[PDB]
Amino acid sequence: QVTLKESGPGILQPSQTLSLTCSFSGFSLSTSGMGVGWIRQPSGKGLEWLAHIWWNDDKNYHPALKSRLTISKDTSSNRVFLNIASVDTADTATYYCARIHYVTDALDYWGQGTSVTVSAKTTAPSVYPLAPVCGDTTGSSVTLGCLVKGYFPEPVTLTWNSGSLSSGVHTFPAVLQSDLYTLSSSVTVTSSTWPSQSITCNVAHPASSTKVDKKI
Amino acid sequence: VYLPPVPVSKVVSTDEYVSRTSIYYYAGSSRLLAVGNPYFSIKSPNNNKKVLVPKVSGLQYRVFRVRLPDPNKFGFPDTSFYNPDTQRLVWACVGLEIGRGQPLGVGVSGHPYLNKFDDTETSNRYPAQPGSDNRECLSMDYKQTQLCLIGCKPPTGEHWGKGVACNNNAAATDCPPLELFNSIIEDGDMVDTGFGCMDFGTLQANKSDVPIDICNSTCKYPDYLKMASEPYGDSLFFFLRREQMFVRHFFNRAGKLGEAVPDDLYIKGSGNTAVIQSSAFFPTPSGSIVTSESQLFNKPYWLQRAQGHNNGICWGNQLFVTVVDTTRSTNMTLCTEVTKEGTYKNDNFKEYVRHVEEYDLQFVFQLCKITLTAEIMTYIHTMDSNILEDWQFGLTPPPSASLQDTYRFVTSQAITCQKTAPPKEKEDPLNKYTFWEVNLKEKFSADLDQFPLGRKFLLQSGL
Amino acid sequence: DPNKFGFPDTSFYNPDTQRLVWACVGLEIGRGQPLGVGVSGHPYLNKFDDTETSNRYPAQPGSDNRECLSMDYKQTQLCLIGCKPPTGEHWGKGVACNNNAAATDCPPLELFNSIIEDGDMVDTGFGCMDFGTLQANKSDVPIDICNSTCKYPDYLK
Amino acid sequence: AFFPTPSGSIVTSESQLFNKPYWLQRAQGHNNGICWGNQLFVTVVDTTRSTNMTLCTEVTKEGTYKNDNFKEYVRHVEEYDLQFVFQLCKITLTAEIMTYIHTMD
Amino acid sequence: MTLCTEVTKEGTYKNDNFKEYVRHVEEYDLQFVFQLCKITLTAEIMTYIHTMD
Amino acid sequence: EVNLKEKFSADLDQFPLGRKFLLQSGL
Amino acid sequence: DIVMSQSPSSLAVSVGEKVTMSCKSSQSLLYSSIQKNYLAWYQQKPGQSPKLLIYWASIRESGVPDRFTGSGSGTDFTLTISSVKAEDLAVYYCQRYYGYPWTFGGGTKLEIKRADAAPTVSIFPPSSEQLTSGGASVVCFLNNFYPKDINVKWKIDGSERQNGVLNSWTDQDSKDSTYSMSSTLTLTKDEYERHNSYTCEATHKTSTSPIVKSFNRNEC
């Protein structure tokens, strides 16, 4: 009945304008009983309320900011738009737009959770295949590695060999130093697949459209 | 276990210390003149501060503020009934007579751009009528009212108006919150006519919902409950009221209705019935018959027990008579020509509208003396201080000294500045306001039967 | 309470075996405002035609003929004082007894009686009954009373 | 199927029922002013002070009258005041009266 | 008193979807006080009541 | 709900009702 | 604002167990006329957005079963679950909507209880293609462990260096139900060519004694 989806610019620069658009189907906002908010969350932190606008054209904002955050709806197209000016480094988060009640006084069903990450400029991923130590004949468990350091933006889907011997994966999240992102990958096998059987790194990076595959 | 909480010093009735004598006196004004425009003032174009023709109509309050000569400045031939070293003299009211000599007949007003949408009595079909501006010319009678107030303090009013909002909230609609106030009733300001006791100047942007006389004013209304509950009671001696109204027609507003009436109460229609009209309705008072025996004037008013604690004694040698009439509020028309010719044309004449109003003040007083003693002088001093001053017999150190030194400086303001506060008594608190003043300092007499009231006063008193 | 009170003198009654209780003797209902009446209406009122002087007619068609009307009500003053909160009455729907070939779907009327609480209205000359469940059109009265019930005292009860 | 519309009459100010005190000397029931439970129940009905306000603000200001520029609101306000005067009563608690008050409450 | 019933549930209002009824209700109470009376009976009183009724 | 729990008084002549009441009381 | 504080950050529960999850505030959530506690709750399933559970602290959302129950009044509050199942693995959030502006709690992470496990240790040098760029990152993969509380240090010739230590955890595995993370010692090649030994050790709740895997730089 109620369907919900958002749409945003995705990639922004510092001191620019943020136009996050929210879209609904199933109701009308001028109806006495429908009401919508806007909630952010980072990847690591918790949740916090930002803005919420009601039927009769009055606005509340988060009083910590209180200046840039200007919420506005378009009841004719049945949509809400979020307008932040001068986006800074603290706004790196994932925003969630949804509908509220007041008999429950909380947020009923939420949407896709659009991701807005702001930094300087995109950088090309430098994929590095981690090779095993020369060392003693250990033979414990040959785990491999292939390190994707220094890229922008998100996301990159790391993949391994297609339809071969599969016994698990260890897909790592992204660490946040200076604007070039940092991420890694691992697959552990019981020291049989290497160097005998094939292994490869497939990297997509769908923004810069480059692709290089590599073996250890 | 509990306790009788707190002993508080009470006020007492004024018949405890005020002593009356057998000396009476008369006063009487002349005929008062008043004339002007029934709708608006005439302002001078060059200097826009002095008036040319003032605005006066039936529905403005006529507050009166008489003056009384101080009885202590009377050389009496036989000064044996009192001692001026121990006593003082002050006046008290016993009578009241207000005269009006205009013929009866109600006045009317209107507004040329009134926000009428449609008549809502027997026929308002569908769909809506086209237009962006549908103001019309309408004229409208008023409700009738009669009242009278007397007292020592000027009367305190109350009215609605725009006040403070609340905190920044997105759940409270854009609607101006309504707040009560307390005001002192001026002259010229208006009475309610079935449209609420609110200011229309700061609450109605369109200026098209009342007739033209009351768009930018505050139609105040007299309080009884707050005024009756004053402990000293020096504001309301004695009062009457009488009013009536009833409906004549029915009308609706026009524009974007600020709240949608909820869907839970009605089934919506289609075809020619898709849109919704307004819900903002308002009546029109018209008024009814006015008899000669529904009058409240040209009648004597003997007083022997006021509802408050003051039994007619008037400190400060001033009274406060306020009166509202509408029964003689009729409006004459004037027609002067430009050219004289033998054929009627609609641009040879000019029209002006005027209104006349007159009054009559008629009083009788009684002399009273106060034997001032040590247990009594403290009792007036907590009530007031000005009456103790202008009698010219003493002054007061307001504390018996203070308890804190409060650390007075001496080197005259060069390091840490504070509130210097240059004082002034301002010689009255009433000087900011404006009343129809009438002097009486050369209008006393002691022989009664040469005036209509004392002839009637001698019969009811049995003397 | 007249037994948890700080009296100035408790040497008149004996608190070992007696009781104190308040009594009402003096009452005044103060009321301060101007004297303007008010109008209410309903924007889709079930009016068909005018029937006071002129209905020269053939038949008249139409799907909906609802109009915007408003009118006042009766002036009515009453006040009453009680130990129990007051009880009133209203007409309403009830049982139907489901028998004997009811070819007419008029619901039977039943006399209910309950307690008056505030926010509820007096009669406006349109019958002391629950308009919400007994009407369906929601278009015969003004909007003020349409979803509610009106009450009235029952002096002889 | 006909139905009439009501119409009010000339409301005066001397045909009111308020601002005039009462002295209950003898009621029609049996409890002459006795207030069990330390509570009263008064209920008043008046529709002679039922006047209706007319609030209308602006969204924009012009030098031309245009109906879209104003939004209309209605409000309504009433004032009430209560005043009471009470007396004190004593009860001689004997044996059988305990049964008499118990079946009452 | 006026009543209306319905035949169908829809979104909008149609004229033939509502069946109507008119009503009027009335109510009384009687209360009576009496006073007992007897009749002493002579001969001519028996004649007087007999010709009365 | 109005509350009159702490608004009592034993002094009659400081209020408009009791002033009329003492006149009717004959005391 | 009126702050929200929740405890603990995570709690391990078995199947069939009752969990009590407590959230507190600094000001009382009751109004003098409303008389309903101004509290609601959330459920953030992994890969899914938070959904609504129970409102006014005692009235449940339509669709939530009877096993979920809210309690608490005044300032202390606890979410009480009768018997937890497979579907309730999530992150829960506290919400006060009493005083404007509204804020959230610290949150709690619910996990289904499985076996305690010490991780499997490994070490890898900086890759020589990264060394041609002039960088040197020694990575350590501590995988397949439970619980999440684990102390990680780095030893460069026995000396502990806290600079250049950035750790990121994964989610739980769906079948093996254990945790995973990595430790990449981010440094410069100019500091790499000086020292010799590079050691990754850890301190876990299952094994207090450190696990070790080392590599001397110059050797091969």
Residue numbers in the entry:
A (entry chain H): 1 to 216
B (entry chain A): 11 to 473
C (entry chain B): 80 to 236
D (entry chain B): 290 to 394
E (entry chain C): 342 to 394
F (entry chain B): 447 to 473
G (entry chain L): 1 to 220
How is this structure described in the published paper?
Human papillomavirus type 58 (HPV58) is associated with cervical cancer and poses a significant health burden worldwide. Five copies of the L1 protein are intertwined to form a capsomer (or a pentamer), with 72 capsomers undergoing self-assembly to form one capsid, also termed a virus-like particle (VLP), that is composed of L1 only. Each L1 structure comprises eight antiparallel beta-strands (BIDG and CHEF) in the form of a jelly roll structural motif which is maintained by connections among the BC, DE, EF, FG, and HI surface loops.
A4B4 recognizes a linear epitope of HPV58 by Western blotting, whereas the other 14 nAbs recognize conformational epitopes. Only nAb A4B4 was classified in group C3, suggesting that it may recognize a unique epitope of HPV58. Finally, we determined the structures of HPV58:5G9-2fold, HPV58:2H3-2fold, and HPV58:A4B4-2fold at resolutions of 6.41 Å, 3.64 Å, and 4.19 Å, respectively. Unlike the binding patterns of 5G9 and 2H3, A4B4 exclusively recognizes hexavalent capsomers and randomly binds to the fringe regions of monomers 2, 3, 4, and 5. It is presumed that the wider space between two hexavalent capsomers allows binding, in contrast to the narrower region between pentavalent and hexavalent capsomers. For nAb A4B4, the simultaneous binding of two adjacent Fabs would create steric hindrance and exclude any bivalent binding potential. Compared with 5G9 and 2H3, A4B4 has the smallest buried surface area, ∼832 Å2. Further, the Fab A4B4 largely occupies the heparan sulfate binding region.
